């Protein structure tokens, strides 16, 4: 599989974290138009966090 | 479109945030086997944050 990606655009973190939730809780998805997200690790900065899928390309 | 979802399993937050990055930075995707994530808002608790896609189903 592809292990490394390149950022195609700048992205500034909003500070949002993941959300704890209980089975049976009702949730609304926000910002669907921006697409899905993945957890990633920066080789360049060493930090880890969520990134938008459509901001990266295989490298 | 579907505006509300129901959680099928419990999920406990890890505390990870989103990541700032510059165009041209190289990144490695972690935990691909867990699938993709969405931003969501809890109707029951009022909080917002990332959730795993395969933990929710469309709901009324």
Author numbering:
A (entry chain A): 82 to 140
B (entry chain B): 82 to 141
What's the paper's own text on this?
The Src homology 3 (SH3) domain is a ∼60-residue modular domain that consists of two antiparallel β-sheets orthogonally packed to form a single hydrophobic core. In previous work, the 3D-DS of the c-Src SH3 domain has been characterized and its dependence on experimental conditions has been described. This work explores the role of the hinge-loop composition by interchanging residues in the RT and n-Src loops between two SH3 domains: one being the c-Src SH3 domain, where 3D-DS has been described, and the other being the Abl SH3 domain, where 3D-DS has not been described to date.
Crystallographic structures of the intertwined dimers of the Src_Abl-2 and Src_Abl-RT chimeras were obtained. Interestingly, both domain-swapped structures differ from those previously obtained for the WT c-Src SH3 domain. This salt bridge is not present in the Src_Abl-RT (Arg95Ser) and Src_Abl-2 (Arg95Ser and Glu115His) chimeras, where these residues are replaced. As in the WT, the side chain of Asp117 interacts with the same residue in the complementary chain [Asp117(OD2)A–Asp117(OD2)B, distance 2.5 Å]. Besides, in Src_Abl-2 the Abl residues introduced in the n-Src loop form a new 310-helix that results in the shortening of the n-Src loop length and the formation of several hydrogen bonds between the two chains mediated by water molecules. As shown in Fig. 8(a), the two chimeras that form an intertwined dimer exhibit the highest B factor in the distal loop.
